[PDB]
Amino acid sequence: GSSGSSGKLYGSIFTGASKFRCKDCSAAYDTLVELTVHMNETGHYRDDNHETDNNNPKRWSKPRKRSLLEMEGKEDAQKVLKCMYCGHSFESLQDLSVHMIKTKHYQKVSGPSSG
Numbered sequence: 001g002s003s004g005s006s007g008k009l010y011g012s013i014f015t016g017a018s019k020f021r022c023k024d025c026s027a028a029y030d031t032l033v034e035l036t037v038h039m040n041e042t043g044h045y046r047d048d049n050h051e052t053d054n055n056n057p058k059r060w061s062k063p064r065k066r067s068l069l070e071m072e073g074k075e076d077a078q079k080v081l082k083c084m085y086c087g088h089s090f091e092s093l094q095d096l097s098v099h100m101i102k103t104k105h106y107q108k109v110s111g112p113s114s115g
């Protein structure tokens with residue numbers, strides 16, 4: 001005699017994804033430009049959440065609140081050229097400019113920080 005059987009192997013893995021999907025029917029697509037066409041052609045529409053409502057009957061917890069402090073800085077309403085570094089009123093621009101350089105005050109007008 002001589003007879004027998006064998007062969008036990010597997011391999012039926014399924015791999016497939018879809019970008020967009022139709023609610024009405026089960027027809028999915030990859031590009032929106034393709035789906036839309038169907039949504040109108042046939043009439044169906046997307047499934048993704050829909051925001052066709054604004055009235056929120058759901059009460060919300062206490063409202064929001066924040067402190068609105070207030071303060072001013074180095075304000076000076078003058079009418080004459082005056083260096084903020086040293087503090088010497090002038091008559092003409094040059095006097096001021098030629099000074100900012102001759103003294104290099106415009107280069108050093110600040111430094112560290114407090115808060």
Ligand SMILES: [Zn+2]
Binds near residue numbers: 027038
């Ligand atoms: Zn459809």
Ligand SMILES: [Zn+2]
Binds near residue numbers: 086100
């Ligand atoms: Zn100066």
